Design an enzyme around this catalytic site. Structure first.
Site, PDB file in Angstrom:
ATOM      1  N   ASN A   1      54.808  30.380  32.102  1.00 41.41           N
ATOM      2  CA  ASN A   1      53.899  31.161  31.277  1.00 41.41           C
ATOM      3  C   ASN A   1      54.601  31.685  30.024  1.00 41.41           C
ATOM      4  O   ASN A   1      55.811  31.932  30.042  1.00 41.41           O
ATOM      5  CB  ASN A   1      53.332  32.355  32.053  1.00 41.41           C
ATOM      6  CG  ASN A   1      52.185  31.966  32.962  1.00 41.41           C
ATOM      7  OD1 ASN A   1      51.104  31.603  32.496  1.00 41.41           O
ATOM      8  ND2 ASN A   1      52.410  32.053  34.268  1.00 41.41           N
TER       9      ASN A   1
ATOM     10  N   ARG B   1      38.728  29.344  40.199  1.00 46.93           N
ATOM     11  CA  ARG B   1      38.345  30.650  40.723  1.00 46.93           C
ATOM     12  C   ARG B   1      36.997  31.089  40.165  1.00 46.93           C
ATOM     13  O   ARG B   1      36.125  31.551  40.911  1.00 46.93           O
ATOM     14  CB  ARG B   1      39.425  31.680  40.393  1.00 46.93           C
ATOM     15  CG  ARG B   1      39.066  33.107  40.782  1.00 46.93           C
ATOM     16  CD  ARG B   1      38.522  33.176  42.199  1.00 46.93           C
ATOM     17  NE  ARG B   1      38.659  34.506  42.782  1.00 46.93           N
ATOM     18  CZ  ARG B   1      38.091  34.883  43.922  1.00 46.93           C
ATOM     19  NH1 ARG B   1      37.340  34.033  44.610  1.00 46.93           N
ATOM     20  NH2 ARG B   1      38.274  36.115  44.379  1.00 46.93           N
TER      21      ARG B   1
ATOM     22  N   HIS C   1      45.253  30.582  28.759  1.00 38.12           N
ATOM     23  CA  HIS C   1      45.429  31.129  30.099  1.00 38.12           C
ATOM     24  C   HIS C   1      45.714  32.622  29.987  1.00 38.12           C
ATOM     25  O   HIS C   1      46.874  33.043  29.950  1.00 38.12           O
ATOM     26  CB  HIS C   1      46.558  30.421  30.851  1.00 38.12           C
ATOM     27  CG  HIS C   1      46.720  30.889  32.265  1.00 38.12           C
ATOM     28  ND1 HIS C   1      45.661  31.355  33.017  1.00 38.12           N
ATOM     29  CD2 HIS C   1      47.810  30.963  33.063  1.00 38.12           C
ATOM     30  CE1 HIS C   1      46.095  31.697  34.217  1.00 38.12           C
ATOM     31  NE2 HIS C   1      47.395  31.469  34.272  1.00 38.12           N
TER      32      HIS C   1
ATOM     33  N   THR D   1      53.034  35.322  40.793  1.00 41.02           N
ATOM     34  CA  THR D   1      51.875  34.695  41.422  1.00 41.02           C
ATOM     35  C   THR D   1      52.320  33.343  41.964  1.00 41.02           C
ATOM     36  O   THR D   1      52.578  32.417  41.188  1.00 41.02           O
ATOM     37  CB  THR D   1      50.731  34.533  40.422  1.00 41.02           C
ATOM     38  OG1 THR D   1      50.131  35.812  40.174  1.00 41.02           O
ATOM     39  CG2 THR D   1      49.666  33.562  40.934  1.00 41.02           C
TER      40      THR D   1
END
Lengths: 297, 265, 265, 297
Positions: free
Chosen positions: B92, B123, B147, B184
């Site tokens: 990220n 999701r 994102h 995560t």
């Protein structure tokens, strides 16, 4: 979690083979009239049980007691020169023997009508059984739409799980591709009517070359029995009553997207179609009814 | 059919464990700098029977002739030194570290991909489905862009099997997972398994993933965000290029929000 | 069809993630003492679409009417207070903490199980298979006794599809994984997934798992070690009870090695 | 990764349906002689492609070029009063037409012989093809052993994946249950000959009630084609040459546990059987050979 399959012909066996290759059945009952064949078919299925997961066969309907789902495939040997109508009617009288003995021993089962014409015959089942609308379903257009989606996805360079369109109406020549709902992974196309003709045609050459459909319709009922038994709440175009939609006024069954689970149809979608589309579905029911009107139940 | 995941963090392993449960790898490779952890190879190598991959190798040149590289740390010129392959950037922010991955490697655009909004779209789809009361496989919709909190919902193409705020619940719920944890792991490993499947088995499925988007929606600079991409044996094969203005300008605002020109190549 | 895993350690989560990939749970429940980690619920809850379980709940009475309880920390009278169920002890040493689980709960023996040598037997089988050059599903053999360096191989029943040191490589390789890591997460989650399947779906499969063995092989006290057990809907259903003396005395030596009478009930 | 299935009868279709429900095929070729049927069968399979994953049909063998695996199911309509021998021989002459055209276009394929008698006919394939021993396999006893394992596991209260026994010899009445290798999850039993009779008998009532086996043998070939295509190195009792085992001196094929992968049979097990067992296998080959000796290739 018992499943019954009435008719151990090419359709029923292909239905039953697809129900078996899917974990779905605790018990599986096969039913017809030629004893020598019922047994031979159940013995062939249980000789390969290690590769499957589940079997009964016979003539008396007490075997079916308390089936959670009863798939009906039994049809009639179609003669040449016989008209569409005399054909339907022979399949109505056959149902005058089947559905009583189904309700008789399984008043709560789900009825899945596969035999043809499936739309008219799903109406006959509803009327002979008196079951509510949720527990009377017809294979309808589930295979049609599936085949439609696959062929279009093949013209594009994508996987069929990422193309979404459906075919509604009569399961037959008057069916209707809903082009306003075509989609690719969250994108409406507006951001092909030939594929539809290839499907209804391809479905006709098969019956001519081979007599019937078996493998394809067996997979499709597998797709359907999976949602009902396992209660996935999945959506399939399947024959339920549409009296009150698209102007129709008669008690005509035909395929509209329904949500399927433990209780059968949980709800019926009420599609908002284009003008043209709404007309073709009205014509599709005009076609069905122009034959349903003339049957003696 | 060799696969490499660099960075045995908590992600790189969730990605590893998910790529092994989908039974995609003939040979999975784990690289990172600290070795005593790396030599995680022996755990995966111990439930081997419960998996379906004969080879699991870890160390610090072992990535040779790999067909897929998942970057999760925490690098590239040494991946390409031996794996000249598809590189899928999970680190990220994905939209930006995929610009870096392609410039620093020289690969064409088909062989440089980022996780992007593949997880975010998955999701989002579930919640709308859990809300209507239908199985998630029958409801279709994607969130494109960055994102992060600037991603865009595409309400112009929601669909229930050929038909016609929940968003902010997905981006907000991603924050709480960083705060309450820091990293995560489990969820990104799935989305990376979902992607790794189409890539390895050439499913030619459509996923919203990060690649070049300049030319679409009035963007004017080399930004990589999530566009619906046809992923397969050769990485990306086609890119889907036109929706409501209300949303296409949302796509530049999300590219505008996309830190680019503030680091040295 | 509710399932509970207590202890969101690195194990309890590998067990969780593996029990969710086998799509066994209608409702998975995670309990532990520290909450800010617990509230791991939201990650699993975010790749939901990639899983097949509608419900994932964590907190600190939520385990009510559960059909299976995996203990991994790190407890019981509160499991039984609401889950009176099958409890499968994964915590170490499994042979001993399953004696505790049954005395402290009062459950019959069918509803008190331990991971035991199910993983050890799986890994052992693979290596012998990777050594002969045949698929591991066709070679059959178990290691019974204590989950540790005293386990016993049963050479009197090795089999290749109806036919007739590698051991120490499995127990030694378990050590290196504790040293090089501290905890063993990924591999035990699989073996616990393998077990949880037969239990939940009533496969009535045979697994070497920990239960009462006094009465077999000349043991004279209430020791629980791994015996081949028929696991199903109701926990254990039958226990297989007689092999070479060379090995039956090895089973008491492993029970002899089995710390029992040195803690207070 | 092409697979060919020669013979689109009940066996071949059930073979092909099981090969399709398994990811295994890139291409699938179906072959026979009635064109109207070949097409109708391929069109029924590709109308349900969305639920499968893969199809060709026709009469000319060039369609089969470079098949990785060629399954042979074609048999002959058995007459009543015809003897076992005149039956075998008609299936030998049919093979005198098939195997040339298989090798002709696919000199490297794996041959899987399913048609009966499979043992004798796997020998005919080996001799007509000239292929090495590894690329000529017969369905043999894979289904027999599978059915055996299931029935015994059902008498015990355990899952069939944790019971392990096998049946070797002729695929027929003279087959042999190897009771010395029975096992339960790493435990030899010595720590049931009726089940074996039920299997060979049950396999006979089926052929009598229904004419043939289709569903069971289709699953079993699925079990086999899975190991070869995907190269699992799995073990199955399958017909290969055993000249040099159990005293046998003729070139007799019959089922012995073999390891199957990309290249066909990677090795043949050399079982160490009990005295009795070794005798029955010798008698089993005496039975096969008492018929194989009299065929004109």
């Amino acid at each position: 979690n018992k499943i019954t399959v009435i008719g151990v012909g090419a359709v029923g066996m292909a239905c039953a083979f697809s129900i078996l290759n899917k974990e779905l059945a605790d018990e599986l009952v096969l039913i017809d009239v030629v004893e020598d064949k019922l047994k031979g078919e159940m013995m062939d299925l249980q000789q390969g049980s290690l590769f499957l997961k589940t079997i009964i066969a016979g003539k008396d309907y007490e075997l079916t007691a308390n089936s959670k789902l009863v798939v009906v495939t039994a049809g009639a040997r179609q003669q040449e020169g016989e008209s569409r109508l005399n054909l339907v009617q022979r399949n109505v009288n056959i149902f005058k023997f089947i559905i009583p003995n189904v309700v008789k021993y399984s008043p709560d089962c789900i009825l899945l009508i596969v035999s043809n014409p499936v739309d008219i015959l799903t109406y006959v089942a509803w009327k002979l059984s008196g079951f509510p609308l949720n527990r009377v379903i017809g294979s309808g257009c589930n295979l049609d739409s599936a085949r439609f989606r696959y062929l279009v996805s093949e013209m594009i360079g994508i996987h069929p799980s990422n193309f979404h369109g459906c075919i509604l109406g009569e399961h037959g020549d008057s069916s209707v591709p809903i082009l306003s709902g075509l989609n690719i992974a969250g994108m409406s196309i507006k951001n092909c009517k030939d594929v539809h003709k290839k499907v209804t045609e391809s479905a006709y050459e098969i019956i001519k070359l081979k007599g019937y459909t078996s493998w394809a319709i067996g997979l499709s009922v597998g797709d359907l029995s999976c949602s009902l038994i396992k209660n996935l709440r999945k959506v399939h175009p399947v024959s339920t009553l549409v009296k009150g939609q698209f102007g129709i006024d008669n008690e005509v069954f035909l395929s509209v997207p329904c949500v399927l689970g433990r209780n059968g149809i949980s709800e019926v979608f009420k599609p908002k179609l284009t003008v043209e589309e709404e007309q073709q579905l009205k014509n599709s029911a005009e076609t069905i009814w122009n034959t349903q009107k003339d049957i003696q139940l």
